[PDB]
Amino acid sequence: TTALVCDNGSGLVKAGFAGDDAPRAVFPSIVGRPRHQGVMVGMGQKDSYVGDEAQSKRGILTLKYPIEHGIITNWDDMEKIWHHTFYNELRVAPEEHPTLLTEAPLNPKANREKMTQIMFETFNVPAMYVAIQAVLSLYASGRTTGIVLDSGDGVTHNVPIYEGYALPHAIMRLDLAGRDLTD
C-alpha cells in the first residue's frame, strides 16, 4: 500500500500520500473553542473547530496552537488535530497506512515517545517512522551534501550534512521563527 507522509510542523500541517509533488491538504493547526454564550438553539454548534474551519469562524473563537516551539505542549489538542487530518482531510483510515512524521532536531525525548505511543495505540497504524526535518529538505533539493537552514514557524535549525554523513556536533538550533516575527 501507500504511505502517509504527514508533517506536523507548527503553524501549518502538511499531509499527503507518498509519491506526489505537493501535499494534498494544507491547513493551519489551531483548535479554537467558542468563548461567548450562544443563544440560538439547534444551530448545531460544536465544541471545538479545528483546522481550516476555525479560520473562518475565528471571530467568536479563541484559537490556540497546540505546538509552541517544535515541542508539543497540549497533547489532547494535538490528538484532535491528527484525527481531523486523517479522517476529514484525507479520508483514509490509519489502520491500513504507514506514517512518516517529522520532528525538529534537539527536541525533548518525551515528545517523540508520546508521539509514537499515540500513533500506535490510538490511531493504530501499521508502522511509523520519525525523521529529522532538515534531512528531508536536503532530499528535496536532490543534493547529498550541503548545510540546510530550515527556518520554520516554530523553530529555526541549521543541520550541516556531508556526503550523507550528518555532523551531530554542528547542529545549531535557534528558537526565533515566524511566530516571534508575527509578535
Ligand X SMILES: Nc1ncnc2c1ncn2[C@@H]1O[C@H](COP(=O)(O)OP(=O)(O)O)[C@@H](O)[C@H]1O
- Name the residue nearer to ligand X (CB basis): 34 or 158: 158
57 C-beta neighbours (distance < 10 Å), count: 14
Interacting stretch for other proteins, rule CB under 8 A, among 3-11, 70-78, 125-133, 138-146? 138-146
Q: What is the greatest pairwise CA distance in the chain?
A: 63
Interacting stretch for ligand X, rule CB under 6 A, among 6-14, 58-66, 83-91, 163-171? 6-14
CA distance 68 to 10: 7
Binders of Mg ion among residues 136 to 155 (CB under 5 A) are 152
Q: Shortest distance, CB of residue 44 to ligand X, whole angstroms?
A: 31
Q: Which of 30, 86, 153, 156 binds ligand X (CB under 6 A)?
A: 153
Interacting stretch for other proteins, rule CB under 8 A, among 10-18, 52-60, 111-119, 137-145? 137-145
Map grid coordinates 443563544 to a residue. Answer: 39
145 interacts with other proteins by CB under 8 A? no
Are 148 and 159 in contact by the 8 Å Cβ rule? The answer is yes
Binders of other proteins among residues 21 to 50 (CB under 8 A) are none
94 interacts with ligand X by CB under 6 A? no
CA distance 111 to 65: 16
Q: What is the DSSP string of 136-161?
A: HHHHHTT-SSEEEEEE-SS-EEEEEE
Residues with Cβ within 8 Å of 20's Cβ and at least 6 positions away in sequence, in order, are none
124 interacts with other proteins by CB under 8 A? no
* Residues within the interface to ligand X (CB under 6 A): 9-12, 152-154, 178, 182
* Residues within the interface to other proteins (CB under 8 A): 139, 142, 144
